[PDB]
Amino acid sequence: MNIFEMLRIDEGLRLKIYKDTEGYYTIGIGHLLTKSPSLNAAKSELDKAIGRNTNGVITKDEAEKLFCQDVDAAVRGILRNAKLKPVYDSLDCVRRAALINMVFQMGETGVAGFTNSLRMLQQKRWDEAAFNLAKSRWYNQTPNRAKRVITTFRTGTWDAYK
Amino acid sequence: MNIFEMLRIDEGLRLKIYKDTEGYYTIGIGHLLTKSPSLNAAKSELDKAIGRNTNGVITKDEAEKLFCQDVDAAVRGILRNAKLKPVYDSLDCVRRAALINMVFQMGETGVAGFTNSLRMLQQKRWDEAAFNLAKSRWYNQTPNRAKRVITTFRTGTWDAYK
Numbered sequence: 327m328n329i330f331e332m333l334r335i336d337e338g339l340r341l342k343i344y345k346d347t348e349g350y351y352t353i354g355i356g357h358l359l360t361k362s363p364s365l366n367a368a369k370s371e372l373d374k375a376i377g378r379n380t381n382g383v384i385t386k387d388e389a390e391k392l393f394c395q396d397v398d399a400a401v402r403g404i405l406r407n408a409k410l411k412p413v414y415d416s417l418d419c420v421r422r423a424a425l426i427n428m429v430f431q432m433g434e435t436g437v438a439g440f441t442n443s444l445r446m447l448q449q450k451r452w453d454e455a456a457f458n459l460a461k462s463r464w465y466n467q468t469p470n471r472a473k474r475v476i477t478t479f480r481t482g483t484w485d486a487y488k
Numbered sequence: 489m490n491i492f493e494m495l496r497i498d499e500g501l502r503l504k505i506y507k508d509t510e511g512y513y514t515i516g517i518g519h520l521l522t523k524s525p526s527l528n529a530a531k532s533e534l535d536k537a538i539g540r541n542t543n544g545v546i547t548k549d550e551a552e553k554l555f556c557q558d559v560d561a562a563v564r565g566i567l568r569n570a571k572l573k574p575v576y577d578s579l580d581c582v583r584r585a586a587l588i589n590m591v592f593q594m595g596e597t598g599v600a601g602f603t604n605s606l607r608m609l610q611q612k613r614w615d616e617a618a619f620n621l622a623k624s625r626w627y628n629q630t631p632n633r634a635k636r637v638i639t640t641f642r643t644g645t646w647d648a649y650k
């Protein structure tokens with residue numbers, strides 16, 4: 327198990343434009359295209375992202391390329407963030423994966439605002455952090471995924487993914 | 489394909505201590521234990537790395553954990569290096585993987601010294617860079633692996649791994 331296999335499990339793989347859990351146009355392995363209600367806007371974002379006229383469909387190779395960029399972007403976002411970097415630096419590799427997962431799903435700014443949970447993680451109070459993380463819209467709206475991610479933070483193991 | 493799958497192909501997976509291509513004690517997915525000729529020294533490094541008395545054998549989970557740390561370390565090494573960071577920043581995701589691969593194999597300092605090849609990469613002179621990279625002990629000692637990595641730099645595709 328690793329960050330790519332973890333997110334592939336959590337995000338799935340679909341080669342045609344679809345709506346994600348929040349109702350937003352998405353493709354590939356959780357590649358958010360746009361929060362716009364317009365399918366045409368989503369198609370234009372897709373063509374720009376892939377560099378050709380796709381008409382709403384991509385190949386597995388193309389999906390994996392967007393995925394690589396998106397994981398890269400989540401890590402870069404963490405490293406550039408004054409709130410996230412200290413926490414990330416303090417974690418082991420498995421828990422780093424859990425943080426990357428959250429940022430991938432919610433964005434840098436979204437996760438950076440979880441001040442209390444981040445403090446507990448930095449303090450290595452794993453059970454307390456886990457309980458605090460579950461007090462979130464994130465947990466309530468995607469409970470099975472959030473439970474897997476929280477288990478990863480709680481245990482520092484890949485048990486929730488095996 | 490991604491950096492983990494790429495290195496897993498290039499490094500293999502072995503659960504008992506073995507000697508790598510340079511004759512150095514190694515385990516898992518290309519986890520170098522020590523350059524020391526002493527198997528006992530290698531066993532001590534392994535126990536320290538895993539956090540238990542292993543007697544020269546690890547599980548697949550443990551091998552994957554060392555692998556996660558080692559990929560993380562290669563990326564951190566690139567980002568902290570004044571010579572490597574500018575090149576890495578200039579590359580697309582696929583070619584970033586090729587650079588991580590080199591650092592994983594040769595180390596931060598080893599790759600950072602390839603001044604001419606790094607310049608050609610930064611300049612996006614892909615064919616020239618590819619020819620220059622092959623003028624190396626690296627290429628001569630591990631030609632099939634180096635060819636795959638160079639192809640990745642030349643094309644910005646995963647063709648050498650599919």
Ligand SMILES: [Cl-]
Pocket residue numbers: 370371374
């Ligand atoms: Cl656009």
Ligand SMILES: [Cl-]
Pocket residue numbers: 467468469470471472
């Ligand atoms: Cl869920």
Ligand SMILES: [Cl-]
Pocket residue numbers: 470471
């Ligand atoms: Cl599920």
Ligand SMILES: [Cl-]
Pocket residue numbers: 532533536
């Ligand atoms: Cl030691």
Ligand SMILES: [Cl-]
Pocket residue numbers: 629630631632633634
């Ligand atoms: Cl080789």
Ligand SMILES: [Cl-]
Pocket residue numbers: 632633
């Ligand atoms: Cl081979």
